[PDB]
Design a protein around this ligand. Structure first.
Ligand SMILES: CCNC(=O)c1cc2c(-c3cc(S(C)(=O)=O)ccc3Oc3ccc(F)cc3F)cn(C)c(=O)c2[nH]1
Length: 106
């Protein structure tokens, strides 16, 4: 697989170039953003920088484990933030695009 190639070359590449991707390209910096409770509430932090490094360095057992990471990134956003927040709308747009690309997964 093949399916992991698609996740790197197609899904990650598409999401990474998107206008709203930049706050998700690296882990949430709780000190810099003044969110001292972030790491108390979110026990499995996830971001596209970590996903990219895992795809490049053979971390994943399979493509489903990578898809789980993308979903954890989105739901961590929905758990920590309020509905309607700008970061939530940015995550929602990325999630919609992610579901489109994942529907054409080989
Ligand atoms: C309830 C309070 N929550 C927050 O304020 C909050 C911020 C973030 C960020 C985030 C992370 C970075 S970073 C990676 O450089 O550390 C930079 C900018 C970030 O968000 C923005 C902040 C201001 C903007 F104007 C626009 C933003 F996009 C990411 N994610 C995944 C979150 O869930 C989250 N919540």
């Amino acid at each position: 697989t093949n399916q992991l190639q698609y996740l790197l070359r197609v899904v990650l590449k598409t999401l990474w170039k998107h206008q709203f991707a930049w706050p998700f390209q690296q882990p949430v910096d709780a000190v810099k953003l003044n969110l001292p409770d972030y790491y108390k509430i979110i026990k499995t932090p996830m971001d596209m920088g970590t996903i990219k490094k895992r795809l490049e360095n053979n971390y994943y057992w399979n493509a489903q484990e990578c898809i789980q990471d993308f979903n954890t990134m989105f739901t961590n956003c929905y758990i920590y933030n309020k509905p309607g927040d700008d970061i939530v709308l940015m995550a929602e747009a990325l999630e919609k695009l992610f579901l489109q690309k994942i529907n054409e997964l080989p």
